[PDB]
Amino acid sequence: EYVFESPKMKEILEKIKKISCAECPVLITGESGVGKEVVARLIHKLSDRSKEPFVALNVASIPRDIFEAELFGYEKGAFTGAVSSKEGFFELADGGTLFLDEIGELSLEAQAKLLRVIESGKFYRLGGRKEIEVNVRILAATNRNIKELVKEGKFREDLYYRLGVIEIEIPPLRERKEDIIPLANHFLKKFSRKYAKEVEGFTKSAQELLLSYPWYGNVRELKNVIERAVLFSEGKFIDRGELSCLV
DNA sequence: CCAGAAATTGGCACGAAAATTGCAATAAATACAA
């Protein structure tokens, strides 16, 4: 279960409901730990293809020298040492969703190779002759400022225009103050059962302290703080002093 | 008989198709050691 109790978050949820049945690539931008993975999996879940694979990938974990071999696949005998034919991630997520986390780590050649497939919709194996057609829905998430990347000369402008048809910008947690308290009480329970420590809630002073801290890690930092508070406590209530050192 | 007209020939051209040549080292089945 997730928490959406802020007007901006509710509007984003309505946008997700409207868009989840479309057939266009989605780009999710935001700060660190805002919930981009949550938004991507919520888009996939509320979809007509929710019973299909959701291939999540990190583009920085794929070496350049074999990049196009991983994404598209190769045939037997394509290169020395190719024991047997193998498929790519595009065919693996055929009929489902392909999620690319931190899309800003791509190189220019990889960007062009991805743009060709996103435009045409069909590709070829590394050592193949027939042409493969796929039905992959592409979601891409990043935390960089993509406009500054394209202005500097690091991200292809046409690729950004192709991907940036729909923009979902999750606001920072510091602009979601009315969402801070329901989140903390959500985490405090989850760890309390997990670590078997007994605790009920936060005192008024601790709740006042929570709303004043300008979170830089957004939801993940709040989760870490709540986990530390649960671990380093034994009483039924968390007070100002327990969180004062953490903050 | 003659001069104009018609027929013959082969050199050059042009697009296409066929033949020739450069490349030089791997892949898989099999037997043996822990």
Ligand SMILES: Nc1ncnc2c1ncn2[C@@H]1O[C@H](COP(=O)(O)OP(=O)(O)OP(=O)(O)O)[C@@H](O)[C@H]1O
């Ligand atoms: N509404 C929510 N309710 C509960 N937990 C949430 C909610 N939104 C986000 N989280 C939690 O926030 C954590 C970090 O979020 P997420 O995985 O989406 O990060 P991210 O935005 O992709 O981060 P990064 O930009 O650093 O890659 C997750 O563990 C997730 O459970």
Ligand SMILES: [Mg+2]
């Ligand atoms: Mg992420």
